[PDB]
Structures are given as C-alpha cells and as structure tokens.
C-alpha cells in the first residue's frame, strides 16, 4: 500500500535526520506544483484514496518500533500503528473518517480517539504547552517507546499526548518548515533537548495563514501582513513571500 520512510533515533545524526526529512518531503510532493516558489501539497478535493497517505516507520535503540500515518494534504499525523494495534485522532468529518479506514488494514485492533490531534487539545492532555515540552533525539526516542507501550497499558495519557506533540513537531512541522527542520538539527548536533521558543511556535500556529497569504498574494505581495514572533517574543510582520522562501517548505492547497 502506502510508501514508507524509515527512521531510527539510534545513533541518529544531523545527516541521518536531514535525509529523513528530505525523503519525507519528497513523498508529499511533487506535482511540479509550485506557487510563488513554494511547493504546494496535493489538493484534498478529488484526491484518490491510494495517494492520500504516507507512512513513517520509527524505531529506537531498544528495537521498539511504531509507524506514523501522515496526510499528504496537510503533512499532519493522523494516527499510528504498533504491532497488533492502531490508533487514530478523531476525524474532522466523514470524508476523513472513511479515508483513514484504508490505513493499516491488516491491524487486528483499531481505535479512534474521541479527541483530535490539534495542539490546543494535546497540550491540555499533556498538562503542558509546547513551550514547556522539550524536543530532540532523546525526547523522540522516548516518544516512540511511549506509543509502543500504549496498547498494553504502560503509557499514561499525558505521556501519550506529550509524545504526539513531539512527533508532530519533529516530523510534520519539520517537513513543513526548513526553519523548524534546522532547529531540530541543532538539538541533534549538540545532543541536547530543548523546548521550542516563540519563533518556532508562532510559525507552527501560522502555517495555514501563511499558506493562504502566499497563494492568494499579488505577484508575491501579501494582501495583509502576517505577524510572527522572535525568540524573545518580540512581534514583527511578513509582507512578502520572498522572505519566506528559505523558511517554509510546504503549503496546504488554497483557492
């Protein structure tokens, strides 16, 4: 069925992770589809089921493994498989409902959470904001383990939510943003974990609005400014696709 990109946190390097994110990006795109120089993800509408998802297999030094499912339209995690069991975030509608039934068809245990995978919800359940959750190879190593143990009852809900937040940001947000990909690279480089600062968070928050601004722009000029934050929380605006070329690697389809 769907394509699989493999990644292991064990002895992971900057090159190791960079090849992984490139590979991941490569599988989302491309229809040679570029608006104002930023690649655009496939349009949800009319998309055949078999082009809908990509799988990401993750494993750690303990040889524990899980597989994440990402929607090619938003590059967001919709759920995961570990062994006999598969879990899914709550679908926003029946179209997305039906869609996810094509994932992990062999898995003998299927579960769909009552809650979605949006940050607001996951932060509540984790007992922490993205601000207070650390990222890096270590946090990811653990997240894999936490998901693996979830079906046997070895993982507390807050720990699971926390583990989702780690995966989404280190995989989805990383694929969406070369800028976020780079922040992760640094953590791996120095073999340290840290929580993301406002510059990462406001980007994540604004991915949809930037997608719109860019695709609906005039010759690259934003109809209206998008305000972001710097590391110290100071606000600034983006008026043009130009400055975002090196920043954002992908966009959800708009128009």
């Amino acid at each position: 069925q769907y394509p699989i990109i493999n990644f292991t946190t064990a002895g992971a390097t900057v090159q190791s992770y960079t090849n992984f994110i490139r590979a991941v990006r490569g599988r989302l795109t491309t229809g040679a589809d570029v608006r104002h120089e930023i690649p655009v993800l496939p349009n949800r509408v009319g998309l055949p089921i078999n082009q809908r998802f990509i799988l990401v297999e993750l494993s750690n030094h303990a040889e524990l493994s899980v597989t994440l499912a990402l929607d090619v339209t938003n590059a967001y995690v919709v759920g995961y498989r570990a062994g006999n069991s598969a879990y899914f975030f709550h679908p926003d509608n029946q179209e997305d409902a039906e869609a996810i039934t094509h994932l992990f068809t062999d898995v003998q245990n299927r579960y769909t959470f009552a809650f979605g995978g949006n940050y607001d919800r996951l932060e509540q359940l984790a007992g922490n904001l993205r601000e207070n959750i650390e990222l890096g190879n270590g946090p990811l190593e653990e997240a894999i383990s936490a998901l693996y143990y979830y079906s046997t009852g070895g993982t507390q809900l807050p720990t699971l939510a926390r583990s989702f937040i780690i995966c989404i940001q280190m995989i989805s947000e990383a694929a969406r943003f070369q800028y976020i990909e780079g922040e992760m690279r640094t953590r791996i480089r120095y073999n340290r974990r840290s929580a993301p600062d406002p510059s990462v968070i406001t980007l994540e928050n604004s991915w949809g609005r930037l997608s719109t601004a860019i695709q609906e722009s005039n010759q690259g000029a934003f109809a209206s400014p998008i305000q972001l934050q710097r590391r110290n929380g100071s606000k600034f605006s983006v008026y043009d696709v130009s400055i975002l070329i090196p920043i954002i690697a992908l966009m959800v389809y708009r128009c």
Epitope: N60, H61, A62, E63, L64, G136, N137, G138, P139, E141, E142, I144, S145, A146, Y148, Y149, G153, G154, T155, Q156, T159, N191, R192, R193
Partner: nanobody, 129 residues
Framework: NAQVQLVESGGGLVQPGGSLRLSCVAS???????????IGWFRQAPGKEREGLSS?????????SYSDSVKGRFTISRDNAKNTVYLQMNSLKPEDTAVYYC?????????????????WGQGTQVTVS
C-alpha cells in the same frame, strides 16, 4: 522478552544529615543490558503510597528527573560495566525514612509514575534518626 531481574541494596539506618547510596543491580543474562533501560526510584511510607523521586531515561543524552522533595540532595547515576544504577542520597533527614524501590522499563523514559515501569526491585528500608 524484556525480562530482567533487579536486585537493590545499600539501604539502612543513618544519622540525620547523613548519606546513603542505593544500587539497582541488573542480574546477568537479560537480553538487553541496563543502559537500554529507564530506571525509576520510588519510596513508600507505611500509611502512604508509592512516590517517584529520581529518574533516568534510556535516552542517549542522559536526561534525569528529580522530584522537588529530593532536588539537589539526590543524584541518580549509571555504571554500565557493572550493569548498575546508583542513587546517592545526601543531607538525609527523618522525613526521608521509608522503603525505597528501583524500577525499570526497556527503552523507557524518566517517569514518576509506577505504571510506566515494568520491573521492580525487592525494596530496601531507609531510616533516619
């Protein structure tokens, strides 16, 4: 499987202000060595329930966690050649008195939750007077 036997030791009676060093020793011939494991340290008073104190992740970056109660007094550490993990309890005081436990999970993280480890030591009593 992940089967491993945890034999702890190093507990006992101590004068207030004193210090002790606990040991989680993983017995030989488990498929994986102890460095593949997260090790939690818990303590339980008779009328009370299990409580997480210090923890160390399986993660390669050596992440450790400490409850507010023991922070700066207690230090968790590894000796891999001995397949062992140490807990150094300093500046000890009577309130610390309780039975202490070591706990492990393969590829685990640093948790204060008993549900989040799969394997336990037999426990060792600590008393400060």
């Amino acid at each position: 499987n992940a089967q491993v036997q945890l034999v702890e030791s190093g507990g006992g009676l101590v004068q207030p202000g004193g210090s002790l060093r606990l040991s989680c020793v993983a017995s030989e011939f488990s498929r994986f060595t102890l460095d593949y494991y997260a090790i939690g340290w818990f303590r339980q008073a008779p009328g009370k329930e299990r409580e997480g104190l210090s923890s160390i992740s399986s993660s390669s970056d050596g992440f450790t966690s400490y409850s507010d109660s023991v922070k700066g007094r207690f230090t968790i550490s590894r000796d891999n050649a001995k397949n062992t993990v140490y807990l150094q309890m300093n500046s000890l005081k009577p309130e610390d008195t309780a039975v202490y436990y070591c706990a492990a999970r393969l590829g685990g993280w640093a948790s204060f939750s008993p549900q989040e480890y799969d394997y336990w030591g037999q426990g060792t009593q600590v008393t400060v007077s």
